[PDB]
Curated annotation (Swiss-Prot):
Protein's recorded name: Metallothionein-1
Molecular function GO terms recorded: copper ion binding; metal ion binding; zinc ion binding
Organism taxonomic ancestry: Eukaryota, Metazoa, Chordata, Craniata, Vertebrata
Keyword Transmembrane part of the UniProt annotation: no
Region annotation (Alpha) ranges: 1-31
GO annotation, cellular component aspect: cytoplasm; cytosol; lysosome; nucleus
Entire-sequence positions represented here: 31 to 61 of 61
Amino acid sequence: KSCCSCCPVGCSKCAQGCVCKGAADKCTCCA
Ligand SMILES: [Cd+2]
Ligand SMILES: [Cd+2]
Ligand SMILES: [Cd+2]
Ligand SMILES: [Cd+2]
């Protein structure tokens, strides 16, 4: 496993440190 339930586990911005403020349903930062 990695950090979020909104992104697919293997992301390009969340790879070493998390950027998301909502965290467990939907985000406006990884589009
Ligand atoms: Cd996320
Ligand atoms: Cd992400
Ligand atoms: Cd994350
Ligand atoms: Cd995000």
